[PDB]
C-alpha cells in the first residue's frame, strides 16, 4: 500500500455542524487518505450501519479508487428508503441509490441537534417531481411543479404547487418523525490506482 499516513477526514463528514437538506444532498470526494472504518462501525453512535456489496468487517482490508461521502437529514421512517431497490418520495424524488450500489448507508438519530422547541424547518425535501431520479441525480431546481394540464405560469394554484416541503422537527414528534443524519459512503472498486486505503502495514 502507498507511502501515506494521513488519516481520513471523516471528522469533516460525520461531526460537521450543518448537514444538507436531502433535496440538495451534499457530497465530498474523500480521497488520498487512510480511512479507518472500524472506529465508525464499532461505535454505538449509529442507529444503522448496514452495507451493500461489501461486509463492514472485511472492508478494513480493502482499498478503493475513491469514496464519495453523501450526507443529508431525513425522517426516521425514511431511513429505510435509503437502500437499493426501495421506493418512496425520498428514493423516487430526492436521493436514488443504484441497484448495483456498493457502500454503507450510515444513519444516527440527530434530534438533539436538528430540532428546536418551535420546530426546525430548515430541512427540506422535494415532495413532487415529474419523474423519478436517476441514481445519484441531483436537481436543486426551485421551479414550480405543474400537476394538471393547466399551465402554472409561475404562480401557485389549485393544480400546481411549490415542490418542496419542510420536515418540521419538533422535539416531541417521536422516534419515527425525529431527524436522522445520514451518511452514504459509496465506493468504486475497479481502477488500478488504489487511492483510499486501509490501515494495513
Amino acid at each position: 500500500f502507498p507511502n501515506i499516513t494521513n488519516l481520513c477526514p471523516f471528522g469533516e463528514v460525520f461531526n460537521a455542524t450543518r448537514f444538507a437538506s436531502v433535496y440538495a444532498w451534499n457530497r465530498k470526494r474523500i480521497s488520498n487518505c487512510v480511512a479507518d472504518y472500524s472506529v465508525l462501525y464499532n461505535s454505538a453512535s449509529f442507529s444503522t450501519f448496514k452495507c451493500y456489496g461489501v461486509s463492514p468487517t472485511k472492508l478494513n482490508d480493502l482499498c478503493f479508487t475513491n469514496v464519495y461521502a453523501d450526507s443529508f437529514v431525513i425522517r426516521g421512517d425514511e431511513v429505510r428508503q435509503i437502500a437499493p431497490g426501495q421506493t418512496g418520495k425520498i428514493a423516487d424524488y430526492n436521493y436514488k441509490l443504484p441497484d448495483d450500489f456498493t457502500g454503507c448507508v450510515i444513519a444516527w438519530n440527530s434530534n438533539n441537534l436538528d430540532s428546536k422547541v418551535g420546530g426546525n424547518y430548515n430541512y427540506l425535501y422535494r415532495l413532487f417531481r415529474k419523474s423519478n431520479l436517476k441514481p445519484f441525480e441531483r436537481d436543486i431546481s426551485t421551479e414550480i411543479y405543474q400537476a394538471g394540464s393547466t399551465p402554472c405560469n409561475g404562480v401557485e394554484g389549485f393544480n400546481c404547487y411549490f415542490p418542496l416541503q419542510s420536515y418540521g422537527f419538533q422535539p416531541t414528534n417521536g422516534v419515527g418523525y425525529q431527524p436522522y443524519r445520514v451518511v452514504v459512503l459509496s465506493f468504486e472498486l475497479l481502477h488500478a490506482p488504489a487511492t483510499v486505503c486501509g490501515p494495513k502495514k
Partner: antibody, heavy 120, light 107 residues
Framework: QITLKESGPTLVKPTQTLTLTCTFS??????????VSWIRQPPGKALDWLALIYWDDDKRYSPSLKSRLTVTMDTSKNQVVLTLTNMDPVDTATYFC???????????????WGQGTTVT | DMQMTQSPSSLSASVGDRVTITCRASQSVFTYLNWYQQKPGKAPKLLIY???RLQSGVPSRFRGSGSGTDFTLTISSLQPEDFATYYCQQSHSTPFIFGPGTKVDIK
C-alpha cells in the same frame, strides 16, 4: 457580566416605522440554543407575543403582523432591531425584548427580561 | 389555529390561602408551557420553565402541573408579595401566544 439588556426610543408618529432596538450582554446570541423574543403589552392589558429570532437566523412572527413586521440582527454589535412599519394606536404599548433558550434540550423559557420601553 | 384561555379572569384571595390558576391550551402543547407573574410597570418574571419545573430564585410555594391541553398552577400559601397578575405561555406551536392573564385580588 450577568445577562442584562436594554431598549431604545419612545417617541412615535403613526405612519412611521417604530425602529426599536435591543442590546444585550452576557450571552452571544450565536451560541446554539440562544434566542431572543419580542413581547409587547398594551397598558393594563394582556401580553402579546410579537416575534422571535433564533440562533442561525431563523425568524418567527405573530401571524396577524407577519405582512407588517420584520426583525433583524447583527452578530457583531450584539443588537436586535424591530421595525413595525406603521403605528395604529392599538400598537401603542410597552415593548419588551426577552432572552431565552430554545435548543432541543431547552424549553423556550423567557428567563430574563429587559425593563422595556413605552411607545407613545 | 391556536388559542389560549385562563379560567378565573380574576380571583379573590387572601394571605396564607391556597390559590390555583388554570390554563387550557387548544392543541396539545405537551409540557412546553411556562408561567409568568407581573408586578405593574415591571417586566414579567418567569416562574416555571415547564409544567412542574420550578426556576431557581423562586420559592417552593410555587409549583405547576399538567400536560397536553390542560395545565394548572398552584401556590400552596400566598405571601402578600405574591399578589400580581399571572400569565401562561405555550412554547411549542410557533406563535408563543400568552394567555389572557389572571389577577389575584386582596379582596
Amino acid at each position: 457580566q450577568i445577562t442584562l439588556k436594554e431598549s431604545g426610543p419612545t417617541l412615535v408618529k403613526p405612519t412611521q416605522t417604530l425602529t426599536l432596538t435591543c442590546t444585550f450582554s452576557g450571552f452571544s446570541l450565536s451560541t446554539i440554543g440562544v434566542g431572543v423574543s419580542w413581547i409587547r403589552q398594551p397598558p393594563g392589558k394582556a401580553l402579546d407575543w410579537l416575534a422571535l429570532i433564533y440562533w442561525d437566523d431563523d425568524k418567527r412572527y405573530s401571524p396577524s403582523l407577519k405582512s407588517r413586521l420584520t426583525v433583524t440582527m447583527d452578530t457583531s454589535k450584539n443588537q436586535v432591531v424591530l421595525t413595525l412599519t406603521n403605528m395604529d394606536p392599538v400598537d401603542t404599548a410597552t415593548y419588551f425584548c426577552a432572552h431565552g433558550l430554545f435548543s432541543s434540550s431547552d424549553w423556550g423559557g423567557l428567563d430574563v427580561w429587559g425593563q422595556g420601553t413605552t411607545v407613545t | 389555529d391556536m388559542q389560549m384561555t385562563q379560567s378565573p379572569s380574576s380571583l379573590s384571595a387572601s394571605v396564607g390561602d391556597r390559590v390555583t390558576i388554570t390554563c387550557r391550551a387548544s392543541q396539545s402543547v405537551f409540557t412546553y408551557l411556562n408561567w409568568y407573574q407581573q408586578k405593574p410597570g415591571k417586566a414579567p418574571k418567569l416562574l416555571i420553565y415547564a409544567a412542574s419545573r420550578l426556576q431557581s430564585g423562586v420559592p417552593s410555594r410555587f409549583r405547576g402541573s399538567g400536560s397536553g391541553t390542560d395545565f394548572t398552577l398552584t401556590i400552596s400559601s400566598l405571601q402578600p408579595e405574591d399578589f400580581a397578575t399571572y400569565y401562561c405561555q405555550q412554547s411549542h406551536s410557533t406563535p408563543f401566544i400568552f394567555g389572557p392573564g389572571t389577577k389575584v385580588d386582596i379582596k
